[PDB]
Copies of this chain bind each other. A is one copy, B any other.
């Protein structure tokens, strides 16, 4: 292992600072001072730190307090060298956001949320973040008649397009990244998956600077393939940031260390981020952000062990995924299964629909029964990836 700043491992303040309250209990750890957080994180080899406005600045802090806090915070950044690549707003903890921020049924709460957001964009630019994340965790319902579903999407669009237009208007060098989540804390959250989020951005006025911020555990809560989803975001060139962690199944969001959930899936996620696509195409070159929570049963030694482990797991997987693809036997297996064959167009240069239709060999004269005999050998190909993952090859 041994992570270093050019690896671009970013961590949020709320991850290592998460104190332990869950639905059945109180915190098991004391609050983490943000200056300690920065120093500690930098010592471990992180590249940057991210935060939610209220992570650093209390909801009711006065203007004198906000500047006191920011002064010590900027100093620590300075002393250590951590950058601040992404900033986000808390539109979910305070009781006022019980029906949402942007999609609250109450008009006065929608304006308050939007004004909280606009102000936070200002702080984002001041910090030097390139990405502004929006997780609409309270946007949704428990009951189907609680909302007008068309109006909920018009109100979501108005807040995002207002925020986007503000970025363009002030000339900030910022992008917005929406973060899909299927449920928890709402029964049903709006824009529940990568596809929903991707679809939605296409209906925006300011779509051009809006992308996604997918989270491993969030797609796994719907039973989806995390690599399939990021592949699709990447293919559309909407993968602006990423949140890595672990999830063992369809249940509450667990927020384990990356690699402590679906291990084989993390392997392939790493292969896609590092190696890209077999035939060439898009690559994700942003930060590798870890959005997790250290288990409540463990003390602060566990908090820093857990932070260390996110980075270890990613470097271990990266190493095995480079060896995997570099292997002559894998490449050969790949060729046999048709991975490079999928890269060739179906139609010949210049062939029209008409042409293919009327080409006897592709249809009328085709031997479907002979084509059906092919051994794709996907089982052997899968076996080679696991032996590579197991450190056996």
A328 lies within 8 A of chain B by Cβ: no
A353 lies within 8 A of chain B by Cβ: yes
The answer, among B22, B108, B142, for a CB contact under 8 Å with A378, is: B142
**Are A279 and B151 CB-contacts (below 8 A) given A316-B390, A381-B146?**
yes
Bound CA–CA A278/B147 (angstroms): 9
The 19 listed contacts between A and B (C-beta, < 8 Å) are: A25-B92, A95-B372, A96-B372, A119-B357, A148-B342, A154-B235, A165-B352, A169-B353, A191-B232, A249-B249, A252-B252, A257-B383, A260-B382, A294-B379, A298-B377, A305-B379, A309-B379, A312-B387, A389-B390
Contact check, A224 vs B182: say whether CB atoms are below 8 A apart: yes
Contact check, A190 vs B228: say whether CB atoms are below 8 A apart: yes
Contact check, A256 vs B192: say whether CB atoms are below 8 A apart: no
The answer, among B169, B192, B254, B381, for a CB contact under 8 Å with A224, is: B192
Write the A301-320 contact mask toward B (1 if CB under 8 angstroms, else 0): 11001100100110010001
Would you give the shortest CB distance from A106 to chain B, in whole angstroms? 6
Copies of the chain in the assembly? 4
Bound CA–CA A191/B296 (angstroms): 21
Write the A342-357 contact mask toward B (1 if CB under 8 angstroms, else 0): 1111110000111011
Chain A interface residue bracket vs B: 35 or more
A137 lies within 8 A of chain B by Cβ: yes
Which residues A140-164 have CB closer than 8 A to chain B?
Answer: 141-155, 158-159, 162-163
A79 lies within 8 A of chain B by Cβ: no
Which residues A327-375 have CB closer than 8 A to chain B?
Answer: 334, 337-347, 352-354, 356-357, 359, 362-363, 366, 368-369, 371-375
Q: Nearest chain-B residue to A294 (Cβ)?
A: B379
Max chain B Cβ within 10 angstroms of own Cβ: one of A137, A141, A191: A141
CB-defined contacts of A194 to chain B, threshold 8 Å: 195-196, 199
Given contacts A151-B278, A162-B353, 9 further A-B contacts (CB under 8 A): A114-B356, A150-B282, A151-B342, A187-B248, A187-B254, A187-B256, A193-B196, A199-B232, A309-B383
CB-defined contacts of A199 to chain B, threshold 8 Å: 194-196, 198-199, 202, 232, 236
Write the A7-30 contact mask toward B (1 if CB under 8 angstroms, else 0): 000000000000011111111100
Contact check, A372 vs B98: say whether CB atoms are below 8 A apart: yes
Segment of A34-42, A43-51, A264-272 engaged in the interface with chain B: A264-272
CB-defined contacts of A172 to chain B, threshold 8 Å: none
Contact check, B144 vs A227: say whether CB atoms are below 8 A apart: yes
